């Protein structure tokens, strides 16, 4: 979850060791389309997206990609506009990688407001990856180009929560929306 | 018989607001009382007959 409005976070990575030895899930969201590929990406110590600013983006998050056996382009994925809190729930069970999304405007201080906001299903595709580690991809936008070397110019705000198997009692409104939830544990 | 769900009912075309990913609706007894038309985007309830 994050409340940014400058399109900083626009992708994530998923994998076991984040190298070419095992498979890795690369999900990147552009301004007009989304690219989701399963390949032996050689992730560096600090993966980030480069920009030559407006267009002509360079994928400097990986070093090599050979197998590349699964690709998926939806281009409806996750931006939900630019005018605040976009919550996402990632699940990997039985080989299928489920993704959820929801757009909720923020009208309070820099903190998680009260209430309930149910997330809507986004996409469900099988990747067959033993996902154990992940890292959030963010656009640097240092007003210039940058090489593939790590520890770039970070000088020029997201929440992370872990899920657990819990029992819930969902309450649906008269219109069919979820307005309350109870964590039995 | 929309998507293989056979039975007996009467369509009423209610004003239920279904979501794009939701197509079937069940009651307390898990009986499908509302379905989405495959061709048109209208909402049709399945109510039992007399």
């Amino acid at each position: 979850a994050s409340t940014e409005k400058s399109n900083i976070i626009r992708g994530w990575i998923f994998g076991t060791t984040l190298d070419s030895k095992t498979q890795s899930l690369l999900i990147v969201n552009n301004a007009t389309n989304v690219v989701i590929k399963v390949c032996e990406f050689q992730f560096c110590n600090d993966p980030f997206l480069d920009v030559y600013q407006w267009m002509e983006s360079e994928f400097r998050v990986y070093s090599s990609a050979n197998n590349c056996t699964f690709e998926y382009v939806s281009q409806p994925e996750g931006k939900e506009g630019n005018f605040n809190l976009r919550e996402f729930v990632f699940k990997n069970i039985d080989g299928y990688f489920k993704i959820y999304s929801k757009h909720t405007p923020i009208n309070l201080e820099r903190d998680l407001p009260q209430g309930f906001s149910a997330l809507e299903p986004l996409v469900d595709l099988p990747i067959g990856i033993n996902i154990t580690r992940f890292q959030t991809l963010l656009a640097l936008h240092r007003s210039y180009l940058t090489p593939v070397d790590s520890s770039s110019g970070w000088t020029a705000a997201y929440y992370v929560g872990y899920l657990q198997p819990r029992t819930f009692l969902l309450k649906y409104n008269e219109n069919g929306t979820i307005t309350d939830a109870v964590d039995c544990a | 018989n929309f998507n293989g769900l056979t039975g007996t009912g009467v369509l009423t075309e209610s004003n239920k607001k279904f979501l794009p990913f939701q197509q079937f609706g069940r009651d307390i007894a898990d009986t499908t009382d509302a379905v989405r038309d495959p061709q048109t985007l209208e909402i049709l309830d399945i109510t039992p007959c007399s």
């Binding site: 998680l112 309930f116 299903p121 899920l163 | 079937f24």
Partner: peptide, 18 residues
Amino acid sequence: TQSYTNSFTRGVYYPDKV
């Protein structure tokens, strides 16, 4: 760099498509 917060009543999604 890292902070610790708590989610009060957020994190729920639709389990099925019914």
